[PDB]
Design a protein around this ligand. Structure first.
Ligand code: HEM
Ligand code: HEM
Ligand code: A55
Ligand code: A55
Ligand code: H4B
Ligand code: H4B
Lengths: 415, 415
């Protein structure tokens, strides 16, 4: 009938009906869409039909065993055999720790929106499939954060919780990411903290979390284990490393009293592998300057600090043509970069980042003749063409294993 | 068997075979591809089958007449009738001047890669469908350039040459754009001028054009009329307005001896409307700073001036993390912006540009429930997220009329 389009800036929505008047095939392209269904893996009410499971499972095992040099046909056959048997006897099956590690890295490799994939091989895997309570999740999460942070020397890691069984017993981290500041609608009408986390913050407030009404209050873990309602847990402050923002030239920069957490970790995605689904598998890598300097600090819908960094630089903040914005954003980026380096916290600029990916992409094409890539995500939010990936044509397809998005729990959860 | 992917930076090519291992529908997305077939309209050996023409023609006329308020049912019916008759009697048909104007603006509106579409309504249309020789094209082109340039006060315009008849009598501007500097491979191994125009420059050399071996030699018009071979014509210098590059603060900027032409006009695209095809319809709008400042000046494959603008600013050009590139590019952009403004030549920054489009997009969605948009093209090559369109989800589909790309003539032309 019509497609919905969202403007993540003003939040407005539009209904497109004109596309119906389109022509032949043409490579209605939904490329610019943030969360399309093709990238979401939703709820389930029953186990996965065996007819679908067994095939996918067999495929995964052949991939796994066909993965290493000096094949192990016996182990391979035995495993195929072993897995089939386990499926007809249990209705599902369990991956060996090695297959799990393999799945997590391949899924990573298969993440078309990640520019850090040259690191795919270096990944720590915390096996928590035996987890059973929310309290145990909290412990596992805390361990993860502590491990990954490594006192500023960031290390990539992921922890796998119990795989979805019937769909009515899913483990789910309700947060979008492990660490993330909250946003409050002040009584004077203004907004403090992360404007983008207003709702979720309310959700935590509603679940008993006590608001501290600050600009950088680290939100709480909202965990749901097995299938029960979500329980709230504050993250032990000693575990949230942060970087205070300061400019290498403008002393008035820290006067802005800005800072950001050092750990970038996605918390609400689903890991799909060999037919199995893991609705809870938080993972982390490390930051790319522009994420904080450009998106977090300069997005209108976020901290929105461009205007004042502008005036502080004594720019013509009232004349767009002056290009003051391009001037300020760069200085902010320099602040972030400088601060992370000074405080010995791993981070990387977008230029170094792009060249890195290009190398990955070529290695990838030589090793397996391809590399799924979402150009719209791989091109940094500043200096796009100054980057190699901007000039690189890319193909974006969904392989498997894969890290999918999933419907926000608070929407499809019965208390 | 496999898809080809190109890196417009290094020019390297990769063969993707992995995509075959993809899964369900998912909104192999070819979004990052520069020239997909879905966006190209190629050669033809025979007229358009009447069975296809008549329907498209009728659609176009119903669009045209259903376009204005206070309908003209009589004129509409008469026209439908008149057009049908003309098709069975001639095998084709001729658009009235108004329909042509309508088609050109709608096609413009339907250009998903254009951020200047808020201007769609203001377009000058030079009717040259009666053109018959290359010399006459040259005259028409010259007029166009002169009109559009308007002494720096740029005006958008397009000139329509004879519509494709049998496919073996096409008018074609071999150049990609009206004005464009040439690139030569010097004997010392270096490259002077526009590195990206090396081949085409050779093509002009091969057709008798005399190289001037400069950094900014305006390439010649390589015109082919009716169906005959292409004839070469140098553009009268008095018609090519240029802007000398100078920085509002660094006096050493002009020491770089840089400049750029003021007229941005695409020359090799095809206009598809009501079943009719126009393989030659050069059009122009005006520049957006980043085009010159970022793409032309900073692309590796183009003038590649980043490195030296960097040293000239006394930056750490050997430490990517220093973000010197983000610093230089902004200054270059300021140079371009400043220079065009100083010399009274129409131009616009990317920030003003984005807000403009956003307005267009909302107007468009209200007026017709949609607006085809290629996010990958609409987001500027610098300060992406600092722009509103970066946060705007977009749908990219091909409507009609439409401006298509076409195969490079020198590839499918028999002399
Ligand atoms: C070694 C360091 C790593 C770096 C520097 C890195 C960097 C990035 C960046 C810059 C983004 C863009 C985020 C955004 O625009 O919101 C991203 C996205 C992504 N990365 Fe990586 N990453 C790393 C490791 C990983 C790991 C270990 C995984 C998984 C095991 C992974 C999975 C993904 C996924 C799924 C996305 C998409 C997130 C989304 O769609 O919201 N990355 N990464
Ligand atoms: C009034 C001023 C206009 C401005 C400021 C404008 C600006 C732009 C810019 C910045 C691009 C990107 C070019 C690139 O990245 O190479 C573009 C693309 C495009 N514009 Fe507009 N434009 C204008 C008028 C027009 C007109 C009058 C037409 C047609 C009648 C048009 C048709 C297109 C098309 C087809 C593209 C795609 C070109 C390609 O795919 O290579 N534009 N325009
Ligand atoms: N470097 C990474 N950035 C984002 C996750 C962190 N994003 C946030 O914390 C956030 C999103 C909006 O506002 C804040 N994506 C990542 C991922 F999916 C995996 C590993 C990473 F290293 C990152
Ligand atoms: N402003 C515009 N830029 C480009 C055409 C000009 N591009 C070039 O001249 C060029 C491309 C590569 O190197 C130079 N696209 C445009 C278009 F298709 C129509 C009107 C325009 F205003 C532009
Ligand atoms: C590979 C990629 O599509 C290409 O390098 C880009 C992306 N988007 C673009 N955006 C615009 N406006 N113009 C361009 O030339 C390109 N090229
Ligand atoms: C609408 C558009 O898709 C959205 O605003 C963008 C584009 N690409 C992106 N690129 C990255 N890496 N991260 C993002 O959040 C986005 N969001």
């Amino acid at each position: 009938q019509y497609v919905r389009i969202k403007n993540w800036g003003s939040g407005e929505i539009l209904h497109d009906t004109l596309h119906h008047k389109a022509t032949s095939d043409f490579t209605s392209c939904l490329g610019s869409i943030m969360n399309p269904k093709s990238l979401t893996r939703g709820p389930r009410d029953k186990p996965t039909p065996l007819e679908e499971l067994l095939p996918h499972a067999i495929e995964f095992i052949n991939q796994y065993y066909g993965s290493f040099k000096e094949a192990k046909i016996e182990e391979h056959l035995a495993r195929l055999e072993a897995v089939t048997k386990e499926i007809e006897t249990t209705g599902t099956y369990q991956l060996t720790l090695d297959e799990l590690i393999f799945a997590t890295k391949m899924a990573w490799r298969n993440a078309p929106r990640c520019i850090g994939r040259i690191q795919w091989s270096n990944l720590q895997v915390f096996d928590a499939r035996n987890c059973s309570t929310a309290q145990e999740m909290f412990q596992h999460i805390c361990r993860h954060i502590l491990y990954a942070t490594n006192n500023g020397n960031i290390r990539s890691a992921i922890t796998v919780f119990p795989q979805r069984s019937d769909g009515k017993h899913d483990f789910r981290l309700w947060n979008s990411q492990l660490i993330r500041y909250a946003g409050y609608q002040m009584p004077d009408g203004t907004i403090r903290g992360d404007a983008a986390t207003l709702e979720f913050t309310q959700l935590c407030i509603d679940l008993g979390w006590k608001p501290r009404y600050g600009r950088f209050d680290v939100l709480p873990l909202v965990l749901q284990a097995d299938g029960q309602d979500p329980e709230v847990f504050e993250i032990p402050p000693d575990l949230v490393l942060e970087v205070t923002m300061e400019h290498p030239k403008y002393e008035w920069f820290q006067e802005l009293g800005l800072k950001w957490y050092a750990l970038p970790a996605v918390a609400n995605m689903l890991l799909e592998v060999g037919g199995l689904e893991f609705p809870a598998c938080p993972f982390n890598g490390w930051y790319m300057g522009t994420e904080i300097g450009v998106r977090d600090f300069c997005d209108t819908q976020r901290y929105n600090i461009l205007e004042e960094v502008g005036r502080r630089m004594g720019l013509e903040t009232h004349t767009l043509a002056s290009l003051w914005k391009d001037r300020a954003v760069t200085e902010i980026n320099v602040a972030v970069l400088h601060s992370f380096q000074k405080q010995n916290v791993t981070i990387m600029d977008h230029h170094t980042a792009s060249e890195s990916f290009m190398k990955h992409m070529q290695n990838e094409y030589r090793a397996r003749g391809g590399c799924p890539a979402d150009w719209i995500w791989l091109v940094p939010p500043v200096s796009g063409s100054i980057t190699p990936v901007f000039h690189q044509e890319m193909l974006n397809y969904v392989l498997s294993p894969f890290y999918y998005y999933q419907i926000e729990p608070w929407k499809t959860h019965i208390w």
